[PDB]
Amino acid sequence: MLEAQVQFASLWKRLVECINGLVNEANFDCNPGGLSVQAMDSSHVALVHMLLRDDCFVKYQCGRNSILGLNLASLSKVLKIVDSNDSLSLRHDDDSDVVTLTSENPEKTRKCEYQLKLLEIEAESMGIPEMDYRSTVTLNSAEFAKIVRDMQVFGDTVTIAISKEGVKFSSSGDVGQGYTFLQAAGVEVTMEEPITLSFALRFMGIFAKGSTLSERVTLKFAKDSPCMVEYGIDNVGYLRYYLAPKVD
Amino acid sequence: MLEAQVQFASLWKRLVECINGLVNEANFDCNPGGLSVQAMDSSHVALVHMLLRDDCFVKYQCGRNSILGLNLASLSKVLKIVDSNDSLSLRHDDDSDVVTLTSENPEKTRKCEYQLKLLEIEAESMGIPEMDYRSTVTLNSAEFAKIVRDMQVFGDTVTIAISKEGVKFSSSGDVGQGYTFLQAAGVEVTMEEPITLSFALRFMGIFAKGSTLSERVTLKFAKDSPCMVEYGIDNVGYLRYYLAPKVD
Amino acid sequence: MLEAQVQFASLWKRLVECINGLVNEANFDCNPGGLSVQAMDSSHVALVHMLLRDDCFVKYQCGRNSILGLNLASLSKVLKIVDSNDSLSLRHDDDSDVVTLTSENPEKTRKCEYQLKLLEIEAESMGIPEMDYRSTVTLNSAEFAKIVRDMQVFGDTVTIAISKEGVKFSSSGDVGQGYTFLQAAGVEVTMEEPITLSFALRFMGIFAKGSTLSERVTLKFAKDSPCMVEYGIDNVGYLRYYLAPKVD
Numbered sequence: 001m002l003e004a005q006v007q008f009a010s011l012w013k014r015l016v017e018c019i020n021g022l023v024n025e026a027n028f029d030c031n032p033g034g035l036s037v038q039a040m041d042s043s044h045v046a047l048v049h050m051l052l053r054d055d056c057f058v059k060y061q062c063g064r065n066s067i068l069g070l071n072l073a074s075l076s077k078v079l080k081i082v083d084s085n086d087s088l089s090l091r092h093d094d095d096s097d098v099v100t101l102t103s104e105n106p107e108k109t110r111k112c113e114y115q116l117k118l119l120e121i122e123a124e125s126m127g128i129p130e131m132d133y134r135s136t137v138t139l140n141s142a143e144f145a146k147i148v149r150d151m152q153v154f155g156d157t158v159t160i161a162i163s164k165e166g167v168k169f170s171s172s173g174d175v176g177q178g179y180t181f182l183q184a185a186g187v188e189v190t191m192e193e194p195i196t197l198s199f200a201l202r203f204m205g206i207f208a209k210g211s212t213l214s215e216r217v218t219l220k221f222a223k224d225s226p227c228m229v230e231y232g233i234d235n236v237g238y239l240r241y242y243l244a245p246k247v248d
Numbered sequence: 249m250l251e252a253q254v255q256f257a258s259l260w261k262r263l264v265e266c267i268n269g270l271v272n273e274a275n276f277d278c279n280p281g282g283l284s285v286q287a288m289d290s291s292h293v294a295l296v297h298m299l300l301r302d303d304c305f306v307k308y309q310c311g312r313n314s315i316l317g318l319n320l321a322s323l324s325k326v327l328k329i330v331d332s333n334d335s336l337s338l339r340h341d342d343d344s345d346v347v348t349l350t351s352e353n354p355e356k357t358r359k360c361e362y363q364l365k366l367l368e369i370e371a372e373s374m375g376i377p378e379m380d381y382r383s384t385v386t387l388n389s390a391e392f393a394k395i396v397r398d399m400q401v402f403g404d405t406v407t408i409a410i411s412k413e414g415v416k417f418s419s420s421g422d423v424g425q426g427y428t429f430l431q432a433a434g435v436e437v438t439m440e441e442p443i444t445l446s447f448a449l450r451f452m453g454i455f456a457k458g459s460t461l462s463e464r465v466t467l468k469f470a471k472d473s474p475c476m477v478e479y480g481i482d483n484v485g486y487l488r489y490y491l492a493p494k495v496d
Numbered sequence: 497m498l499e500a501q502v503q504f505a506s507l508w509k510r511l512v513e514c515i516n517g518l519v520n521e522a523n524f525d526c527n528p529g530g531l532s533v534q535a536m537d538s539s540h541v542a543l544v545h546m547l548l549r550d551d552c553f554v555k556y557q558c559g560r561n562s563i564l565g566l567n568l569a570s571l572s573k574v575l576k577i578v579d580s581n582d583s584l585s586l587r588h589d590d591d592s593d594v595v596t597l598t599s600e601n602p603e604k605t606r607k608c609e610y611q612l613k614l615l616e617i618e619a620e621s622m623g624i625p626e627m628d629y630r631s632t633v634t635l636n637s638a639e640f641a642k643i644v645r646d647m648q649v650f651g652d653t654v655t656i657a658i659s660k661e662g663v664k665f666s667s668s669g670d671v672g673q674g675y676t677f678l679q680a681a682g683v684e685v686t687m688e689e690p691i692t693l694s695f696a697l698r699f700m701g702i703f704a705k706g707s708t709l710s711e712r713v714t715l716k717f718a719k720d721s722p723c724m725v726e727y728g729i730d731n732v733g734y735l736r737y738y739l740a741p742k743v744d
Contacts, residue, residue: 074423081398098424109431110391112398116424143606150577150608175570178610186605322671329646329674346672357681363673 002030002068002092003061009088009103011056011233013079014212018239019048020072021206027121028068034060034237040126046203047226049128049240056236058087068092068099069121078114092118129242133220133228135162135195138188141211141231144219147180148204154178157246158204161196162221164189171201195221198246204229207241214239250278250314250340253307257336257351259481261327262460263298266487268320269454270296275369276316278340282308282485286375294451295474295490297376304484307337316340316347317367326362334358340366377490381468381476382440385415387430389465389479393456395428400449402426405494409444410469412437419449443471445493452477455489497589498526498562501555505584505599507729509575510708511546514727514735516568517702518544523617524564530556530733534622542699543722543738545624552732555585564588564595565615574610582608625738629716629724631658631687635678637707637727640715643676644700650674653742655694658687658717667697691717693741700725703737 006012019026022041026048029036034053040046054060082088082103089102103112147169151158154171161168166182166189210217210231220228224247231239254260267274267285274287274296282302288295302308326349330336335352349362395417399406403421415437418427458465458479466478472495479487502508515522515533522535522544530549536542550556578584578599585598599608643665647654650667657664662685666675706713706727716724720743726736 077401077423078426081401109434111429112427113429114424114426146577153573153577175573176610176612178574179608181607181609183605183607325649325671326674329649357679357683359677359679361675361677365672 001061001063001094002066003059003089004030004035004057004091005059005087005089006056007058007087008084009079009082009086010084012088012090013082013084015050015052015233015239016072016076016079018209018212019050020076021209022046022048022203022241024073025069025071025119025121027123028070029065030062030068031065032062038124038126038128040124041203045200046241046243047126047128049242050238051240052233052237056234066092067123069119070099070116071119074116078116082112086112129226129228131222131225133222133225134192135221136188136190136218137162137167137182137221138216138218139167139182139186141208141214141217144217145208145211148201148208150180151178152201152205156201157198158201159196159198160219160221160227162189162191163194163196164191193223195223197221197223197227199227199243200246203241203243207243210239210241249309249311249342250316250338251307251309252278252283252305252338254304254336254338255306256332257327257330257334258332259461260336261330261332263481263487264320264324264327265460266457267296267298268324269457270294270451270489272321273317273319273367273369275371276318277313278310278316279313280308280310286372288372288374289451292374293448293492294454295374295376296488297490298485298487300481300485304481314340315371317369318347318364319367322364326364330360334360377474379468379470379473379476381470381473383410383443383469384436384438384466385410385469386436386438386464386466387415388434389456389459389462391430392465392467393459396449396452396456398428399426400453404449405446406449406452407444407446408467408469410437410439411442412439443469445469445471445475446495447475447491447493451489451491455491458487458489461487497587497592498558498564499555499585499587500526500531500553500558501583501585502552503554503583504580505575505578505582506580507548507552507709508584508586509578509580511548511729511735512568512572512575513708514705515544515546516572517705518542518699518737520569521565521567521615521617523620524566526558526562526564528558534624536619536621537699540621541696541740542702543624545736545738546733547736548729548733552729554583562588562590565617566595566612567615570612574612578608578610582606625722627718627721629718629721630689631691631717632685632714633658633663633687633717634682634684634712634714636682637704637710637713639678640713641704641707644697644704646676647674648697648701652697653694654697654700655692656715656717657692658685659690660685660687689719691719693717693723695723695739695741699737699739703739706735706737709735 023039026039037050039048092099098115101114151171154173159170168181170179214231218230226242229241271287274285277284284299286297337350339348351360399419402419407418409416414430414432416429455477462479468476474490477489519535522533525532533546582599588595596611647667651669655666662678662680664677710727714726722738
């Protein structure tokens with residue numbers, strides 16, 4: 001028996017777009033502590049972790065640790081048609097084969113109910129990278145997203161370069177070469193190594209949809225490792241993406 | 249020698265857009281009691297009747313009664329180039345092959361004049377049902393339009409249920425099942441008897457575009473009777489759609 | 497070498513859009529006088545001539561006459577991602593095979609540096625054919641844009657017709673037959689005789705994007721001659737297009 005009402009559907013909408021950019025279906029892992037979604041893309045290069053804590057909701061009910069597999073195509077299609085400022089209640093009854101979304105005004109004059117069939121999705125091996133990072137940069141989410149889009153005019157690969165002065169995103173291709181250089185303040189570096197890696201812009205792109213959730217974004221880098229980009233969802237959750245670097 | 253100056257060309261623009269949704273060509277019945285298009289889609293399932301009473305125009309003139317066949321696709325292309333806040337005089341002359349649109353500024357500094365070829369179109373041998381309709385509902389025209397587009401994510405068929413409590417719009421398909429319920433008395437339901445019919449969303453869709461003319465819309469129903477959907481062009485005319493239900 | 501710095505990159509963004517419509521590569525002739533593109537379209541029917549004068553730039557060094565072949569496609573692609581409000585400094589060091597654009601933020605938190613390869617651009621065939629222009633006509637550049645967009649629904653050839661009263665742009669095609677007349681209101685016609693040319697609309701449309709650089713535009717005509725359409729950039733240069741008439 002589960003029931004998670006949220007005040008403003010804005011949140012669910014912005015979130016599902018965010019994880020849908022990375023995967024078609026995923027398991028909604030619901031505990032008394034909150035909804036969790038963990039998922040890897042089909043090329044096993046990059047990973048989403050999303051937590052929404054119990055207090056993120058107006059009302060949250062999850063005695064048992066039930067799981068829900070959900071088609072994020074259908075889910076996304078449906079959230080599309082739900083007003084930003086309407087309330088949205090996700091509920092699964094005791095052994096139904098469908099989850100239900102349920103939507104109302106502030107003023108109760110219109111009520112929408114949608115039902116989605118669930119799916120056996122084999123929960124994956126996957127594995128959050130277990131490391132700690134000796135380099136962290138925080139910056140404006142929207143600026144971040146613009147920088148990936150920028151770099152894409154050049155390549156499929158951005159080269160990030162943290163130093164104590166600031167980060168230096170670079171890229172190359174037929175069009176030419178470009179970099180965008182950032183300076184500390186603005187940007188918040190916390191480095192202890194001239195550490196500089198390369199990544200797939202396709203994914204950085206996908207991750208950067210995170211700016212719909214959070215004015216700021218933190219990137220984290222350990223030498224030769226899966227970087228992390230984190231989007232704080234208020235103080236009541238996070239969106240976390242981990243991506244493998246390109247290596248020789 | 250027809251002549252028909254509307255004053256704000258928006259009306260003609262917003263109208264043709266609507267009716268063009270349903271049909272590529274249409275005869276304009278031009279009496280001294282106004283203009284009226286009557287027409288069926290090619291799948292002979294859905295009907296438009298629009299009348300602009302002669303009080304509608306700041307200049308009307310139709311001694312005789314003429315029919316004028318028009319390619320609406322071409323009439324639409326010309327009308328998308330016409331500034332909503334301009335004069336728009338229509339005009340046909342005796343044995344003339346061509347009708348003539350003519351726009352002017354408020355401040356008489358810009359004259360535009362287009363010229364379209366008439367068609368011969370076979371006169372329509374279905375026209376109106378002439379029905380009772382004792383079941384009625386009236387709701388904000390944009391919500392109606394939002395709703396048909398919403399229901400379209402689920403299926404090609406909307407099922408409309410009317411009780412005195414309200415009006416439920418339901419739909420089913422691959423994605424899931426959806427419904428949108430509206431409360432009564434903001435919706436003015438008023439029925440004699442509780443009934444529920446089903447319809448092709450394609451056409452409901454087409455009809456909904458009427459939301460650009462009237463802020464409110466009126467639906468009327470009857471058991472195994474082509475429903476009607478009506479849009480008052482304020483008090484100077486109407487646009488009216490009729491659609492066959494889907495029975496088993 | 498050459499340095500040229502603009503205060504607001506808006507200018508370059510808006511210029512390269514205009515001239516890229518006509519040709520995908522051009523030579524920038526650079527003097528102490530200023531930057532200067534001059535280029536024909538590949539059918540030798542239309543000619544662009546831009547001048548950015550030395551005072552257009554906050555900073556402009558160019559000791560000797562270098563000539564730079566640039567790929568306007570690529571430049572366009574880069575400039576699309578430069579912010580309007582950032583500055584843009586364009587340098588080239590004398591044996592370098594590369595031009596380099598640099599973009600700083602007013603508050604110095606962000607610096608961007610893109611670099612493009614030069615091209616050996618063979619054709620500088622050229623030849624600004626000045627003649628004595630009898631008739632002039634000057635009008636709001638957006639209206640002119642709009643008029644050609646409109647004339648395009650009819651045909652691919654506009655006939656401009658200039659007289660005491662004003663000017664009549666007309667066109668014909670499968671859709672029908674339109675015209676647009678502008679009274680001498682502003683609209684400063686200032687002719688000597690009646691005069692009626694016709695012109696490819698494709699090109700007129702390419703030209704009409706100049707409306708992003710100048711609230712007004714000016715057309716000059718001469719019997720059996722190329723027209724000129726000029727857009728002035730402040731008092732610091734011009735963009736000037738020349739188009740041959742259709743005769744037959």
